[PDB]
Ligand binder design. Structure first.
Ligand SMILES: OC[C@H]1O[C@H](O[C@H]2[C@@H](O)[C@H](O)[C@@H](CO)O[C@@H]2O)[C@@H](O)[C@@H](O)[C@@H]1O
Ligand SMILES: OC[C@H]1O[C@H](O[C@H]2[C@@H](O)[C@H](O)[C@@H](CO)O[C@@H]2O)[C@@H](O)[C@@H](O)[C@@H]1O
Ligand SMILES: OC[C@H]1O[C@H](O[C@H]2[C@@H](O)[C@H](O)[C@@H](CO)O[C@@H]2O)[C@@H](O)[C@@H](O)[C@@H]1O
Ligand SMILES: OC[C@H]1O[C@H](O[C@H]2[C@@H](O)[C@H](O)[C@@H](CO)O[C@@H]2O)[C@@H](O)[C@@H](O)[C@@H]1O
Ligand SMILES: [Ca+2]
Ligand SMILES: [Ca+2]
Ligand SMILES: [Ca+2]
Ligand SMILES: [Ca+2]
Ligand SMILES: [Mn+2]
Ligand SMILES: [Mn+2]
Ligand SMILES: [Mn+2]
Ligand SMILES: [Mn+2]
Lengths: 232, 232, 232, 232
C-alpha cells in the first residue's frame, strides 16, 4: 500500500493480525510476551520469539518522492534471574523472514551469525556480550545486517518499569533514529545515517524479536503503533 | 489492531498485501482487475474474482465504546458486450472467506445462494436480475447475508468513467451508508440501519468481489483507502 | 481545509490554540476548567465559560461527496454543592459565536432563549430543569438551535469520575450520535437524524460550553481529539 | 495541541482558516497566489505576500519524548518577465510573525536584513542574488534566521509546471530535509542538521511567503498538507 498505519493498545491470545514465531505469545496480562514465561510468571531461559504484523509493508518504491515510517511502542523487561538477558528489538526484514538457526541468546533471534535478505533493527540490549562488540553496559543499538550495532548508546534499563520508544526514518534525511525513556527519567537517543533502500527490499514485514539465554527476563510489548507512507 | 488504515493509490502485479481469489489480478494499467480481461483488453464472460487486504481487521470488540470504519475507492466499469454485467462490490466477511461455489454472474461472487459466516457488502449492480429481487434498472445496494439487497437506489452507471464511492459505519449510529458519484454528475446514496456486530464476527477481512456472466464488463478498482478504529 | 484533525492530551494556561470565552481557563491540574473554580478548588456558582479551537473548520461544501467529523473527549464533573449543576456540552456554531446574553445556568451558555446562526450541541445535563423540557433525571441530549433537546437519554453521571464521550456524524448517514461512559460502567447512546448542512453554515468553530447556576460543579475537559474531512 | 494535521486540496477567496499578509490572496483558479497577479493573469513586480494557518502550532514541549512535523505542497511558478523572480518558501515563525519591513524581492518577505523571534524556512529561489550568498543558479535552500541559506542545492525550476515538495523533521534525528520534484523529472534534496527547539519558540505558526522584485513570476500554492505531533 502507499500508506499504512495500525495501532495496538493491547493484545489478545492468538492476535489474528500478528504472525507469531518461536515462543512468542500473548499472556493473560494482554501483553505480547516475546519470550517464554511460565505459569508462575517466571521468564524461561533459552527462549526466542518474534511477532510480525501479518500484512507485508511497502517500505520503498523507486517512483516515490519520499518514503518514511515511524513506530512507537511500550515494553516491560523484568529480570527472572538476578541479572537480565538478553534483549528485545524492533526489526524490519523480508516478508518471509524467519528465526535464523542459532540466533538464540546474544543474537536476539535476529541473526544466525555473530559476524534481498537484509535485516535492520533497533536493539534494547540488557546483557553486555563484549566478545561480540557490545559495550560493557546495557544499551540501545541500531543494527544493519549484523548483531554488531552500527550505532549505540548507554541505556539505563529499569527493571519492570514500562519504557516508551519511538523509532523514525524517511528517505530524504536518510537517518534512522530511536528515542526511548521511562517516566520521570532522562531519555536516550541513538541515530545512524543509512539509506534503508540500499539494505532492505521494497517489501518487508515489521515487528519484534527477543531472547533470553543463560540469563532471563520478560520481553513484553504492551502497546504498538506503526505508520509508513510513500509519497509520489 | 485497535485501529488500522491503508491507502492504495494504484496497484502492481502480485500486490503482496492483497489476497487474490478467482480471476482477480492487477493489469499493466496498474488497476485491480477483479474480473478477467484478455490481452486485447476485452472483458471475459463467466468470470469471478475477489481481492482482500492481507491482514485480518478487528471490526468489533465488546469492551469498546464505539467501532467504526470508512472506505473510499474509485472504480471503472466498461462494458465488453453491448450490455454490461454483472457488477462489483465492497464486502466484509470472515477472514477465511472464499468464493462460494456457484456464486458466479448475478451472485457477484459473494453468495452461493440466491435466497460466524456473515457477509455484508455494498453492490454496484450493472445488470438487473429481476427474478431475484433486482429493481429493473442499474443500482447500488446494501446486502446483508443475501444477494437480495436490504436497501438499494437507482444508479446511473457511466461506461468507462471513473466513479468514486464512500462507505461508512460506526456502532453508535448503527447505519451503513454509501455515496457514489461520477465527475460532473449527481451522487447517489444508499443507507441501511444495521448493527454490524450482530451479523459479522469480531474479526473480518475486507475487500472487493466482482463477476461477469453471459454479459461482460471490466470491474477495475483504481484506488482504495480504508480506515477502522475501536475506541475504548 | 478539506480535512483537519487535532489532539489535546492535556492543556496549559493560555493554551494558544484555544479561544477562551467567559470564565473558561486552564487549571494547575492541566484540565480545561470551563467554569470557575476557586483557589481551594471549589466550583463557583453563576459561572459560564466556553472554549473553541482557534481555527475555523469547514464542515460542509456543496461540491463534496461526503462530509464527516468525529470527536472524542474525557471530562470530569464534581459537584460543589450537595447537588450538581448545570452541565457542559460539545457544540458547533458560526466562527464568530459568542456567549449569548442571558445564557447562564440552565441554558448552558449555548442559547439566550429557553424557547447562519445555527447551534448544534451535545449536552451532558446534570440538573433537570423540567419547566424547559428536561426529563426528570440527568441525561445527555442533542440540541439543534434549542436548549430543548431533539433527542436525549438518561445519563448516570458519576461524581468526579472521568467520563469518555464520542460524537460522530457524516453527511451520508445524516445521523448525529454520541456514546458516553465511565470505566466499569454501561455506556449511554443518543442519536438524532439530522442533515447538519441545513442548520449550520459551511464554516464553523467547535468546542465546549458549560455553566453552573444556583448549584455548582466543575466542568473540566481533560483531553480532546477532533477530526473532520470533506471528500470530493 | 499534542498533534495537528490539516489538508488543503485547493483554496477559496477569503479562506477563513488562513491568515493573509501583504498581497497574498486566492484566485479564481482556486490557487493560493502569494504574490500579486493582475486581471489578465500577469504577475506584478515589487510584490510580497504570505499566508499562515490560522491556528498556532505547538512545535515543541520540554516534556515530550519526540516532536516532528512534515508538510507536502504543490506549487506553480510562471515567469511574468522574460526571467523569473524572486521565490517562494515554506516557513515557520512566532505566531505573531509579520512581513518584516524591507523584506521585498531578494529577501522573500522572510527577513528584514540580508545579514523568540526565530525564522526557519525552505526557500525555492528562482533568481540568483550572488551578492548575498545565492549560488549562481536557481536553488532550494534551508534558511535559519538568515536569507543566507545554511544548506542549498541546485534546483531545475520548470516554468509553469506543478512542483511537489515534501519537508520533514523530528527532534530525534535533528535533521530538516526537503525533497522537491516535477513530473517525469529528477528530484532535488536538501538537508541541514539543526535542532529546531534551539532556534524556534515552543509555539509557532506555519505557512508560505513569496515575493517578486524587479523581475516577476506567479507564486501559487495549489495544495498543502501539514502534520505535527508531540509524543510523550
Ligand atoms: O543470556 C546471557 C548469555 O548466556 C549465554 O552466555 C553465557 C556464557 O557462555 C558467556 O561467555 C557469558 C558472557 O558474559 O554470558 C553467559 O554467562 C549465551 O546464551 C549468550 O548468548 C547469552 O547472551
Ligand atoms: O451476465 C448476465 C447474466 O447472464 C446469465 O443470465 C442470462 C439468463 O439466464 C437470464 O435469464 C437473463 C435475465 O435477464 O440474463 C442473462 O441473459 C447468468 O450468468 C446470470 O447470472 C447473469 O446475471
Ligand atoms: O443551577 C441550578 C439552577 O439554578 C437556578 O434555578 C433555581 C430555581 O430558580 C429553579 O426554579 C429550580 C428548578 O428546580 O432550580 C434552581 O433551584 C437557575 O440558575 C437555573 O438556570 C439553574 O439550572
Ligand atoms: O526581482 C529581482 C531583483 O530585483 C531587484 O534587484 C535588481 C538589481 O538591483 C540587482 O543588482 C540585480 C542583481 O542581479 O537584480 C535586479 O536586477 C531587487 O528587487 C532584488 O531584491 C530582486 O532580487
Ligand atoms: Ca547483548
Ligand atoms: Ca444484478
Ligand atoms: Ca438542565
Ligand atoms: Ca534569490
Ligand atoms: Mn548489543
Ligand atoms: Mn442487485
Ligand atoms: Mn437538558
Ligand atoms: Mn537563495
Amino acid at each position: 500500500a502507499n500508506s499504512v498505519c495500525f495501532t495496538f493498545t493491547d493484545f489478545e491470545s492468538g492476535q489474528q493480525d500478528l504472525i507469531f514465531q518461536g515462543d512468542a505469545s500473548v499472556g493473560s496480562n494482554k501483553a505480547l510476551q516475546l519470550t517464554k514465561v511460565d505459569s508462575k510468571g517466571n521468564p524461561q531461559g533459552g527462549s526466542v520469539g518474534r511477532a510480525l504484523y501479518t500484512a507485508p509493508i511497502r517500505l520503498w518504491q523507486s517512483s516515490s518522492l519520499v518514503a518514511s515510517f515511524e513506530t512507537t511502542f511500550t515494553f516491560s523487561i523484568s529480570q527472572g534471574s538476578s541479572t537480565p538477558a538478553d534483549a528485545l528489538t524492533f526489526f524490519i526484514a523480508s516478508p518471509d523472514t524467519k528465526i535464523p538457526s542459532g540466533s538464540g541468546g546474544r543474537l536476539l533471534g535476529l541473526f544466525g551469525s555473530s559476524n534481498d535478505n537484509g535485516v535492520v533493527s533497533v536493539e534494547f540490549d540488557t546483557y553486555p556480550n563484549t566478545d561480540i562488540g557490545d559495550p560493557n553496559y546495557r544499551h540501545i543499538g541500531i543494527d544493519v545486517n549484523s548483531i554488531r550495532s552500527k550505532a549505540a548508546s548507554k541505556w539505563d534499563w529499569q527493571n519492570g518499569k514500562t519504557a516508551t520508544a519511538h523509532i523514525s526514518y524517511n528517505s530524504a534525511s536518510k537517518r534512522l533514529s530511536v528515542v526511548s525513556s521511562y517516566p520521570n527519567s532522562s531519555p536516550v537517543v541513538v541515530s545512524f545515517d543509512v539509506e534503508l533502500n540500499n539494505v532492505x527490499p521494497x517489501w518487508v514485514r515489521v515487528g519484534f524479536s527477543a531472547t533470553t539465554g543463560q540469563y532471563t527476563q520478560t520481553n513484553n510489548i504492551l502497546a504498538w503503533s506503526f505508520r509508513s507512507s510513500l509519497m509520489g
